[PDB]
């Protein structure tokens, strides 16, 4: 059905001349075949070529496969001896991909052909892809549309298909979703019994967050355990843009490895806490602003045509956000590439780290806003926020615009509909824009191209459709997923059904997720994986401050959602810090408590890992490598020492 | 000069019959034959006997020494492959102390004679112990009580005497002498120029103690691979005490195991918080009415006979504490029979964590009562102190203890003083009760039963005077020294000069420990470790915990030593509650910085390690283990591939 084509390989023409275009092609076809892969060639596009990648022998293919074995080995990744070559299958589809998508890119030295698209010699090679298996994925589709849980078969598919990369996404998004049930049945037991801003609600949740995270560290070990992929990091791919000051050449492999300095980056890297502060600022204050503006045009101002200037906040916030945090990325990629960053898995999840202050800004900064400054203040804020009624000064005219005034009176309502917002709104629109609207849009891209060699006409046009699909980043769905889970942490007293919400949502995130990898998204090359990344210290991270603004948030609205109506007198700042205080480091006790219980629970797979690395040790031994002296003349054996302790007893 | 003698068994007949006697004495002299020792039979005191054991045969001692290196390489602790056993020569006396120790004491199914003293089959069997080198330990102590530093070798002769766990605390106090040259410079400069309570010395001191920390963590990474140590758990001496449930035989091994359930352990271990509330209770309660008796009688009363009436505070002190300590020691030690803990190190780590809560209250909580209820409080807790008058009551008459009042007026040096007293004249006390008074008592022990066969007759009698030596704990000077950076870390910032102190106390204290080592106490069998332990944890705790103390204790004492001058008027709650905020969250920050700056730093031995085993699985992989097919027809080699290409640009 996909012709037995592993990779198709696209090489852009148009944007060079004839004979550079045929030089490099011909350089890329040798290349191709010189590491023992077959090629066909095909109009891609009308400014592309289609080279199809296939393993020229099934003996190759063995060998390749054995190869990568041995490294893995080698490097300790597995424990269990490689197979002979002779034996040397590749035990699922993802092995097979994975062996030749290395065999492409990665160095000549490291025996494979250098082919990095998008960079100096390769700049022409646009992308190398994989074709999607549309049987399996729509069988998959339709058997797990219609369960609760997916099997740990149904994981295993996943990852056998799309590598443990995707794998571990869909493996922690299932945990998640069966540990939301039971903050979503309390949270809803508390919402009909307690009510919002409850502290057993509180506790609860911060327990429940320390309880998942760590448990979910544990279950990462058993995973990476039982998918060969734990210290995967040893046999990283190297990124071609790395720049070495020095080359050396180590004696245990046989290589030169181009050296840089470890310090010499730490410094380049203290550059990021300027840039976290940069963002903070740039962003607070698009964010801040557009509070103020918000707050003067729905609850200070009231003049003629309200709504029609209350969507200006939220649109000029919609417009803004997006384009300030382009900008951040574009300097954060900036500061990722001066540091230096051999490979590719750490160059990822700098940036990562990198983009993450931009991520807690946007997604929490208004509800932090909202929480910490608009009700405390704002009625001792809203007499500087006259200032803003020329945003209302184009539209009215200026007396309109300044007789437009009433008792401020803080709205009790503002924050349980910000996070309401942010907690199904944002959920269903999100889903929307990430799954319907991507898909309508390829769809009639599709149409107005379709619109305005005869027995591969339908698999051709259909690999020229999937080479237009978007590249799936499965960091997007991990940053999705933790920031959703930043929500629960921080804010869900304000309304204790929002892990009801998250259920639901992460349920249906499951398949909506999987559905926009199969059919809108270029099927990704096997990466491996033996966890979500840096995304687990933002959990870590998003639990310990959610267990202070958590806390924070029940003292300040012990007496109902009104709180501090507006006016900071009621909150003893004494009585608001104490509670963060013994709450913060309640939190930092019990999580000790947990993780140290959870670290004397070995997992089966870390067991079998363990003595297998002891049988394998054993296994290698068992073939390969197999004056003073009168003192001790007195008594010869163990019995005259029997009868002189006898004589000495007696 | 010691006579080939490896170990010393003392065998205690006096409180037992002759029957029972002999026939234990040939039980045990069968088993020291069979596990291929050789025995001499001394008397050793008038109620005990001695067997000196001795390795029977070279060639059996090469053996054991290479089955030995075969189950630490078995079982990952090393990864050179062991040397074949005609090369098994122990490389140091520590390595054939350590093999011949577990050929006397593992169990019989483990390959050795199971004479376990002070346990069930074997009570008569006192102590087994190796006998001191006289003149390699004068040797070194005359050879670096003349240098600053210890070199290496120096720690590394240390190792191969007394094994790694004596070898890592003389490495960690001298790495611990070596750091704090930098505060105790920075704190005499502070003192000089600044004087105490300064907020660039305190964060100077916080950033030190999180830099020391991290590092000594790193070096211990590097040491214990160093010294062949690392993974040395995986090896750890199971404890004869352990009480299986039920017996399992694991099929790697062809062995019973019995196995404990661990979830049962931490149910067990539940009744940890208790103990630690009870001796917080006891210990606390001691000390505050001690404390609040030392406030009475000598700044409330004012009679006669004042300094006859002071020193009984601390009289009491002295008494009770020691015998609290000591009942909270019995219940600890019932406590951590009650969790079973297979082997003995984990037995050891978890006693002294349980310990660890008695040390701390114990050392800290005279100086947090002076610094944070005496200083802020007592002009409010003295008109309740007139009913300790009864405590003076028996030396004075009832009027006269009536009649001695005066205005409260707290003492402003008292805070120094304490801090002063606790980190100079305790270090000279402690120093003077922990080396020369047992000294001194040993010698007149000795003189006493000295005052009121002929060729060994002097060998015989300093075997007989080793036999009463101390039995050396290293887990006792390395609580001394967790304690001891405890002070530095929680209130160095009331007294600038005590990291001087310390700097001076410490370079004594590593020559003075190993004369203890040498002279006072039994040579300890060489027992191995790849860390301090639990210390490790408990100085990252005091480090924690003393970010928050000095920060306080900079914002009370502000205003000069005086502070506060017995009122909670001049202390704005929330501004501590703020500082103590925002230097305890600057002190993590600062930390996670600084620990994945140095995580990123990978020591040498420990890269040496890792390319190790990557050798090591190279060798053992060197020695062993030596219509859809229309669609490729199309285009044969990567030639017509190119020309196919060049045809389609064109
Ligand atoms: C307030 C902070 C604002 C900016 C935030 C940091 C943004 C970092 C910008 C990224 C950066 O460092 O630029 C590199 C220049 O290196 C540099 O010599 C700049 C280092 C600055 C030393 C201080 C480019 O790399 P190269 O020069 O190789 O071309
Ligand atoms: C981002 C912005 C976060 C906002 C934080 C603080 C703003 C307050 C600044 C201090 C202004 C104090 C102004 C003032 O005079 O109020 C006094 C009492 O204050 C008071 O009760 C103080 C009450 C202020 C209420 C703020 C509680 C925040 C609790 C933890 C939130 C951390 C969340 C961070 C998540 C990343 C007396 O009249
Ligand atoms: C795809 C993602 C799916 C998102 C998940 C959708 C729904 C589950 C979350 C509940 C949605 C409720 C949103 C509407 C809502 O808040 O209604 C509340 C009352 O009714 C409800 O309590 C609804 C019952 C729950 C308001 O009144 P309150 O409760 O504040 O007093
Ligand atoms: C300077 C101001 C000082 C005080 C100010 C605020 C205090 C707010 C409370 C902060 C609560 C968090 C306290 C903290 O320091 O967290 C560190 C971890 O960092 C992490 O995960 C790394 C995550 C970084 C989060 C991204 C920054 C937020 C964006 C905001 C950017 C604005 C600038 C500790 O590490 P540690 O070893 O204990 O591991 C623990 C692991 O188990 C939790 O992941
Ligand atoms: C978490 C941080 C947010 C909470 C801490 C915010 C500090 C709130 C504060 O300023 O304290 C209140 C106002 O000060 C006062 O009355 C008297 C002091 C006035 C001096 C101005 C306060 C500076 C606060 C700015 C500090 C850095 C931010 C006293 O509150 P109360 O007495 O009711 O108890
Ligand atoms: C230990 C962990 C907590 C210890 C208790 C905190 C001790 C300090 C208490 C400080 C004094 C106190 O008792 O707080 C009272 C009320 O607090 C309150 O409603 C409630 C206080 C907040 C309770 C803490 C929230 C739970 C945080 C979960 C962390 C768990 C993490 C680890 C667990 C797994 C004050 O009344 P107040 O009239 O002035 O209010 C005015 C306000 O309502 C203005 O609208
Ligand atoms: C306030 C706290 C005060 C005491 C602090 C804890 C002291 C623990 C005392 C040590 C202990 O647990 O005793 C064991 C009894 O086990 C037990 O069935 C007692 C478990 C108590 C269950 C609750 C003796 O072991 P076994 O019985 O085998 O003889
Ligand atoms: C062990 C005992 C530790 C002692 C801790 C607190 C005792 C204070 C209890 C609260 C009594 C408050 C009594 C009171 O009414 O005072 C008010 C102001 O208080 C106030 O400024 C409060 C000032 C109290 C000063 C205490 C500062 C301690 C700072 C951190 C020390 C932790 C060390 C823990 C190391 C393990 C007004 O008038
Ligand atoms: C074995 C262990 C050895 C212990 C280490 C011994 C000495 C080093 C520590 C300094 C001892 C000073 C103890 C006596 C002392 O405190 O004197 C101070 C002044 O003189 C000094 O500053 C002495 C100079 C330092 C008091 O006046 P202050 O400075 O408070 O104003
Ligand atoms: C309940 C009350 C709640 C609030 C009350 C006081 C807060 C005092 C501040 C405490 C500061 C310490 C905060 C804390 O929780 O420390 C834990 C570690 O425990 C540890 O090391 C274990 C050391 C335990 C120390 C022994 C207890 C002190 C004796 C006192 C006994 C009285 C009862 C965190 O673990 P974590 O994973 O981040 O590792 C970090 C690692 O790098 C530091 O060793
Ligand atoms: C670290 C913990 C030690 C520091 C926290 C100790 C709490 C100190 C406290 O009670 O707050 C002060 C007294 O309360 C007041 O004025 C008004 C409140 C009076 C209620 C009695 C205080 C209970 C404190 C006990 C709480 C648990 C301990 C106010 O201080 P200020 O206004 O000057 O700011
Ligand atoms: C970030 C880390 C710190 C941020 C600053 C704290 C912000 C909160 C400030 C709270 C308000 C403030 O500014 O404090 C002033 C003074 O403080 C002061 O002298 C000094 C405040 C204490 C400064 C903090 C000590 C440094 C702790 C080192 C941690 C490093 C760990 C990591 C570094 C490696 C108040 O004056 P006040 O008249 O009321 O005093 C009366 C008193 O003297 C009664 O005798
Ligand atoms: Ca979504
Ligand atoms: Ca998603
Ligand atoms: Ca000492
Ligand atoms: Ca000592």
Redesign the interface.
């Known amino acids: 059905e996909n012709?037995?084509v592993d990779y198709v390989i696209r090489?852009n023409?148009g944007d060079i001349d004839?004979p550079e275009?045929?030089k490099k092609?011909?350089v890329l076809?040798?290349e191709?075949?010189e590491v023992g892969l077959?090629?066909?060639?095909r109009?891609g596009d009308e400014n592309s070529?289609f080279?199809?990648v296939?393993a020229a022998s099934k003996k190759k293919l063995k060998r390749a496969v054995y190869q990568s074995r041995?490294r893995d080995?080698?490097?300790?990744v597995r424990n269990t001896?490689?197979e002979?070559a002779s034996s040397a299958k590749p035990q699922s589809e993802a092995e097979r991909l994975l062996v030749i998508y290395h065999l492409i890119t990665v160095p000549k030295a490291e025996g494979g052909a250098g082919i990095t698209p998008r960079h100096g010699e390769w700049k022409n090679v646009d992308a190398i892809f994989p074709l999607h298996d549309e049987e399996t994925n729509r069988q998959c589709m339709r058997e797990w549309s219609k369960k609760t849980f997916l099997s740990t078969e149904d994981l295993d598919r996943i990852r056998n298909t799309f590598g443990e990369h995707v794998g571990f996404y869909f493996a922690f998004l299932q945990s998640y979703f069966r540990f939301l049930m039971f903050p979503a049945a309390f949270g809803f037991s508390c919402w009909l019994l307690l009510g919002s801003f409850s502290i057993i609600y509180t506790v609860v949740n911060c327990l429940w967050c320390i309880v998942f995270i760590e448990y979910w560290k544990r279950q990462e070990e058993d995973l990476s355990c039982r998918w060969q992929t734990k210290g995967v990091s040893a046999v990283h791919e190297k990124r071609a843009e790395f720049k070495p000051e020095k080359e050396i050449r180590?004696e245990?492999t046989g290589e030169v490895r181009g050296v840089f300095p470890?310090?010499k980056?730490?410094y380049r890297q203290l550059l990021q806490v300027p840039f976290a502060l940069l963002a903070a600022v740039a962003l607070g204050a698009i964010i801040a602003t557009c509070f103020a503006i918000e707050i003067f045009i729905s609850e200070v101002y009231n003049g003629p045509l309200k709504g029609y200037l209350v969507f200006i906040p939220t649109i000029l916030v919609s417009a803004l956000i997006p384009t300030m945090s382009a900008v951040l990325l574009t300097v954060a990629t900036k500061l990722n590439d001066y540091e230096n960053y051999e490979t590719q898995d750490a160059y990822k999840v700098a940036l990562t780290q990198k983009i993450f202050v931009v991520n807690f800004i946007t997604s929490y900064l208004p509800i932090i806003l909202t929480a910490f400054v608009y009700v405390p203040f704002a009625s001792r804020i809203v007499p500087y926020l006259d200032v803003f009624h020329l945003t209302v000064r184009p539209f009215v005219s200026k007396e309109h615009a300044i007789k437009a005034r009433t008792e401020f009176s803080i709205n009790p309502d503002r924050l349980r509909k910000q996070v309401i917002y942010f907690t199904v709104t944002a959920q269903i629109v999100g889903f929307a824009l990430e799954t319907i609207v991507p898909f309508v849009k390829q769809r009639v891209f599709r149409e107005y191209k379709e619109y305005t060699d005869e027995?591969?006409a339908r698999?051709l046009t259909r690999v020229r459709n999937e080479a237009e699909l978007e590249d799936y980043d499965v960091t997007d769905d991990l940053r999705e997923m933790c920031i959703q889970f930043g929500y629960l942490a921080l804010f869900s007293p304000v309304w204790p059904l929002v892990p009801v919400s998250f259920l639901i949502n992460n349920w249906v995130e499951l398949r909506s997720d999987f559905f926009k990898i199969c059919v809108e998204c270029k099927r990704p090359w096997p990466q491996r994986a033996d966890t979500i990344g840096p995304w687990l210290d933002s959990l870590g991270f998003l639990s310990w401050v959610g267990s202070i603004t958590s806390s924070a948030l029940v003292y300040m609205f012990s007496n109902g959602h009104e709180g501090p109506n507006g006016e900071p007198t009621t909150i003893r700042?004494?009585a608001l810090?104490?509670t963060?205080?013994f709450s913060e480091h309640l939190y930092l006790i019990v999580r000790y408590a947990v993780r140290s219980?959870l670290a004397?629970?070995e997992p089966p797979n870390t067991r079998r890992e363990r003595?297998e690395?002891?049988?394998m040790?054993?296994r290698?031994?068992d073939?390969?490598?197999?004056?003073?002296?009168?003192?001790?003349m007195?008594?010869r054996?163990?019995?005259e020492?029997?009868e002189?302790?006898?004589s000495?007893?007696?």
């Open positions: 012709h037995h090489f023409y004839t275009a045929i092609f011909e076809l040798l191709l075949s077959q090629t066909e060639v109009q070529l080279v199809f296939r041995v080995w080698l490097y300790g001896e490689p002979p180590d245990s470890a310090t980056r730490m027995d591969e698999f700042c004494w810090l104490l963060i205080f219980a004397k629970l003595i690395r002891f049988m040790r054993k290698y031994l073939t390969v490598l197999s004056p003073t002296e009168r003192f001790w007195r008594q054996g163990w019995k020492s029997a002189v302790g006898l000495l007893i007696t």
